Amino acid sequence: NLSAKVVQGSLDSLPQAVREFLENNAELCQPDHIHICDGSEEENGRLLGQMEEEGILRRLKKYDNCWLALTDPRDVARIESKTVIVTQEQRDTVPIPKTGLSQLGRWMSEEDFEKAFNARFPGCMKGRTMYVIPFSMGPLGSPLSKIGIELTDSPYVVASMRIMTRMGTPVLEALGDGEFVKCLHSVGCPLPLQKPLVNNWPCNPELTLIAHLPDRREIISFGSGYGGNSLLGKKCFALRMASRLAKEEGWLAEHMLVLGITNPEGEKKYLAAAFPSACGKTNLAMMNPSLPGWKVECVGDDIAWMKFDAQGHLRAINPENGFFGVAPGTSVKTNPNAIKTIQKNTIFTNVAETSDGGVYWEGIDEPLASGVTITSWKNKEWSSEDGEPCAHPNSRFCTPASQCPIIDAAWESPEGVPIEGIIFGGRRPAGVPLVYEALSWQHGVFVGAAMRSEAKIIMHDPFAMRPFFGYNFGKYLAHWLSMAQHPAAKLPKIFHVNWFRKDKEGKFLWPGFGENSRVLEWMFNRIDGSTKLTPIGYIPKEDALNLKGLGHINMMELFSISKEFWDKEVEDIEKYLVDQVNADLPCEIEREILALKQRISQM
Ligand SMILES: [Mn+2]
Numbered sequence: 001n002l003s004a005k006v007v008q009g010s011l012d013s014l015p016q017a018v019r020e021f022l023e024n025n026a027e028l029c030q031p032d033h034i035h036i037c038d039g040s041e042e043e044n045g046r047l048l049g050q051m052e053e054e055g056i057l058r059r060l061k062k063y064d065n066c067w068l069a070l071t072d073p074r075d076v077a078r079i080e081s082k083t084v085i086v087t088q089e090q091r092d093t094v095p096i097p098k099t100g101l102s103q104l105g106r107w108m109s110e111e112d113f114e115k116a117f118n119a120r121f122p123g124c125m126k127g128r129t130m131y132v133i134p135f136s137m138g139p140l141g142s143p144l145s146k147i148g149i150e151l152t153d154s155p156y157v158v159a160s161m162r163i164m165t166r167m168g169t170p171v172l173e174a175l176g177d178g179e180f181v182k183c184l185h186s187v188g189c190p191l192p193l194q195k196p197l198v199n200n201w202p203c204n205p206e207l208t209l210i211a212h213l214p215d216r217r218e219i220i221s222f223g224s225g226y227g228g229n230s231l232l233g234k235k236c237f238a239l240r241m242a243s244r245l246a247k248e249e250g251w252l253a254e255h256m257l258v259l260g261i262t263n264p265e266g267e268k269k270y271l272a273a274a275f276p277s278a279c280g281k282t283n284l285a286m287m288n289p290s291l292p293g294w295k296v297e298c299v300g301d302d303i304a305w306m307k308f309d310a311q312g313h314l315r316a317i318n319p320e321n322g323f324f325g326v327a328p329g330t331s332v333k334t335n336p337n338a339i340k341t342i343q344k345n346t347i348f349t350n351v352a353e354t355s356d357g358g359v360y361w362e363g364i365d366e367p368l369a370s371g372v373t374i375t376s377w378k379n380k381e382w383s384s385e386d387g388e389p390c391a392h393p394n395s396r397f398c399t400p401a402s403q404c405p406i407i408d409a410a411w412e413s414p415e416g417v418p419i420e421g422i423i424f425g426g427r428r429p430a431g432v433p434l435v436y437e438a439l440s441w442q443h444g445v446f447v448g449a450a451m452r453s454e455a456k457i458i459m460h461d462p463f464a465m466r467p468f469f470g471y472n473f474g475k476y477l478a479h480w481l482s483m484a485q486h487p488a489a490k491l492p493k494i495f496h497v498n499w500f501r502k503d504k505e506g507k508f509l510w511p512g513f514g515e516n517s518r519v520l521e522w523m524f525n526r527i528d529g530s531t532k533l534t535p536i537g538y539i540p541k542e543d544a545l546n547l548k549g550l551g552h553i554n555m556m557e558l559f560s561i562s563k564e565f566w567d568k569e570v571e572d573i574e575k576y577l578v579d580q581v582n583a584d585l586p587c588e589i590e591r592e593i594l595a596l597k598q599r600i601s602q603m
Contacts, residue, residue, distance in 0.1 A: 002026060002034070007129070008043075009036030014132075015177050018149055022132055025151050025184055030123045031130035037158060039134075039168015047155045055200040056156060060348070061357035068359070069156055069349045070377055071225065072198035074205045076350065077394045078228040078235070080467050084108040085212045085240065095474045095584040103460065104473045104580055113211060120188065120207050120222045127191020128153040133161050133183075134171040137233045137242075137319035138305070141174045142414035144317065146242070150183035150232045154202075157185060157230045160347060163322040163398050165233045181217050181241065183232035188223040199379065201225060212236055214244045214470065227324055227349070227396060235468060238303045238319050243470035247479050251307035255464045257285040258300045258316050258417065260408045261520055264293030269524060272304050272316055272492075273423035274464040276453040280499065280512075282325045286337035286404055289517030291546065296517065297408040298337070299417060300401075301325065306419060312488040315416030320401065327351050327395045331365040334513055340405050347398040350377045352390035361391035420527050422492045426453035426461065427500040431565040434510055434558045435497045435519045437526060437538040441484045444494030446592035447537070449477060450573045454500070460576050474584020481588050493527050496537070501558055509558045511550065518546050534561050535599040563603050570596050 002023060003011050011019055014036070026034060037043065048067060051057040060066040084106045085093045093107035108116070131152050138145030152158065161167050188204030189197070208223035219236045221229055228235050242253035256272040275281045285301035300318030309315045325338065327348065332339050342348075352360040355373045360366075368374070376382035376390045401407055410417050424447055426432075438444030448463040460466065462473060469476060483489060497519060499512045522540050531538035539559050547553055574593045577585055 005032065006034045006036065009038060009132075014172065015175060017177065018134070018172070018175070018180070021149060021182055022151065026130060028121055029125035029130060029151075029153070029186060031125035031128055031153060033129040034132065035129050036132045037134065037168060039162060039170070043168075044159060044162055047159055051155055051159070057347075058353070059357070060353065060359060062354070063343060063346075063358070065345045066342075066359075067347050068351065068353060069201070069347065070199045070379060071201045071350055072203050073378070075201065075203035075208075075224050075226050076392055077226060078467060079208060079210075079224070081106070082208045083210045083467065084113075085214065085470065086110055086113045087214065092472060094469070095472055095581050098579040098582050100579075102580065103466065104462075105469045108211070113213070116209060117211075117220065120209070121184075121186065124186045124188055124190055124222070125153045131155065131158050133158060133167060134169070134175065135161055135165040135167045135233055136171045136174065137165060137238050138317055139412045139414050140166040140170060144414060144416075145319070146181065146237075147171060147175045147178065148181035148183050148233050148237055150185060152185040152230070154185065154187050154225055154230065156225060160227060160231055160398050161233070163347065163400050164231050164324060165321045179217070181219065181237055183219045183221075183237065185221040185230050185232060186223075187225050210236060212240050212470070214241055217241075227398070231324070234303070234320065234324065238305070239465075239468040240470040242305065243465075243468070243476070246305070247471060247475065251305060252479075253470070254304045254306065255302065255468055256300075256304035256316075257281050257302065258304050258318060258419070259285050259287070260297040260299060260410070260417065261289075261524060262295035262297075263521075263524060269420045269527060270299065270316065270417040271421040271423060271520070271523065272306070272419050273425065274448065274451075275425045276427070276451070276461040276464045276466075277455065278326070278329075279425055279427055279453065282323065282338060283335050283513065284516065286335065286341070286406055287517065288336050288514055289520070290514035290549070291517045291521060294517055294521070296520070297406045298401075298404050299408045299411045307416070308486055308489060309416075309418075312486065312490050313418040314490070314492055316419050317414075317416040318401070318411055322401045323397075323399050323404070325397050325399070327359075327397050328361045328389070328391050328393055329363045330361070330397075331363055333365060334363070337404055337406050341403045342397050342399045344403055345400060348396070349398070350392040350395040351397075352376045352382060361395060362389050419492045421523055422494045423497055423523070424448045424451055424463070424494070425497045425499075426451050428452065428458070428498050429454055429500060429502045429506070431562065431569065432496075432498040432501065433536075433539055433561060434499070434501065435495060435522065435540065436534070436536055437531065438494040438496070439537050441491050441494070442481065442588050443537070443592050443595075445477065445480045446589055446596075447494060447496050448480070449577060449589060472584055474581045474586065477581070477589055478586045481586055493523070495523055503554065503557065509554050515550065521546055535566065535603055536561060536596070563600060566600050570600060
């Protein structure tokens with residue numbers, strides 16, 4: 001029966017639970033074949049070649065083993081509207097807002113979900129192969145890591161998973177008869193194709209739905225092939241589901257990069273930072289610092305799982321195995337370590353391709369040689385005069401973390417790394433100083449809770465988690481607050497930064513990139529215990545910030561704090577938190593709102 005559709009590996013080789021899971025969805029999705037992924041280079045080579053044949057991937061000959069996927073323009077990014085969490089009670093997923101609709105997540109009834117499921121998955125994989133992906137989120141074999149099993153009908157998803165996680169036979173070895181997260185994905189285009197196929201990229205935008213069923217330890221994704229919607233260990237699992245798990249077990253799951261910074265005296269600290277959309281998450285994570293004698297090393301650029309250790313140190317681990325980085329804006333100047341990481345074994349999605357088989361995108365800042373032309377991401381010849389970018393703004397590179405030249409020696413340490421500083425941020429063209437320090441852990445929690453960022457629209461993005469909350473944000477805030485009561489906790493110092501303050505002409509006041517190291521320097525020394533008090537927190541006092549080697553900086557305007565602006569700021573924050581979190585807003589947050597309001601009143 002089933003055994004006969006297996007084209008790689010052995011049913012009997014799977015632990016019973018894994019097998020039962022496979023049997024159930026195979027019988028449900030009706031795939032022509034079953035491929036049990038082993039994660040070997042050989043298998044990867046096979047899948048890539050096939051992908052080349054079917055025209056799903058193109059080979060980029062300028063580089064060593066680099067590929068390019070072009071998608072249907074209708075499937076290029078996460079769709080928040082189509083992203084849901086399924087629980088018995090709405091309250092458990094999102095707070096009931098005072099007005100309008102929740103901006104803190106999208107909830108769906110068990111009932112509505114069954115209907116939506118039944119309308120999508122039966123026979124969804126016919127004419128296609130169902131791949132079985134065993135994967136570990138976090139270092140392989142660590143008892144603190146979580147294992148998942150993802151069923152997919154997309155070889156692109158497979159090849160990407162091989163990079164973004166530990167994947168294959170060794171993962172199954174470690175799982176044994178242990179529990180796992182059930183992950184079901186399907187591009188939603190059974191053969192024969194009922195609709196036209198674009199760029200050989202199967203997707204079903206109409207019926208696109210990314211679901212999470214925490215009580216069942218299940219993730220169910222339909223209709224999109226885009227990474228955030230299909231790499232189930234990443235957002236769906238390592239952020240959403242995990243934040244819920246963690247909330248139940250004392251730890252934390254955050255949208256945070258993790259970096260290790262060393263001063264000229266050899267002292268080293270690890271910092272974590274939560275930044276929204278652009279904001280240069282990856283640029284900070286693998287920054288080449290401008291300050292002589294300093295050293296920045298990368299642990300992770302997207303996700304952090306943190307748990308207090310026996311001495312009360314917040315330990316962070318990167319459960320990812322690679323970087324799913326935004327490509328436009330990436331250059332030698334802005335992120336030299338990133339350029340180097342991707343010279344090899346990397347999958348690019350939706351970038352442009354030079355005629356010598358290289359890659360290209362806005363802000364690559366790499367002049368073309370005589371006679372090199374550009375094929376844009378829509379497979380058309382391209383010039384600067386066409387009025388559309390050569391690469392999609394959300395285009396991606398998918399690269400092994402082990403290739404980053406400054407990958408931290410402890411990025412896979414099962415013990416994790418001790419966080420001494422948490423950094424919040426956003427793109428605020430006006431009003432918010434370059435860097436400020438929270439006055440207390442409670443105030444710091446409020447700072448993260450107050451996060452806003454210019455997507456020309458400025459939106460709220462609490463802890464940079466707006467699209468990723470796995471449960472009630474009100475409760476998420478309480479959990480964070482409770483940390484100040486954990487026995488002998490060594491709470492990280494909390495800062496808020498802004499690299500995007502503009503002058504009236506809209507020109508940046510701060511150069512950024514390598515120079516942010518200067519800000520990092522200030523944070524580092526503060527952790528070691530100086531400040532100028534302001535209503536919003538501590539800023540660097542005069543001449544404390546290291547400006548040696550910089551052109552001129554308008555420090556006066558960069559750190560300017562206006563009552564007019566901050567009046568409207570706390571006003572907007574209060575309204576947002578009270579309306580959106582409503583009955584679930586922790587009173588400690590209420591106190592910080594009022595306290596900030598008070599402090600602003602005496603200026
Ligand atoms: Mn992210």
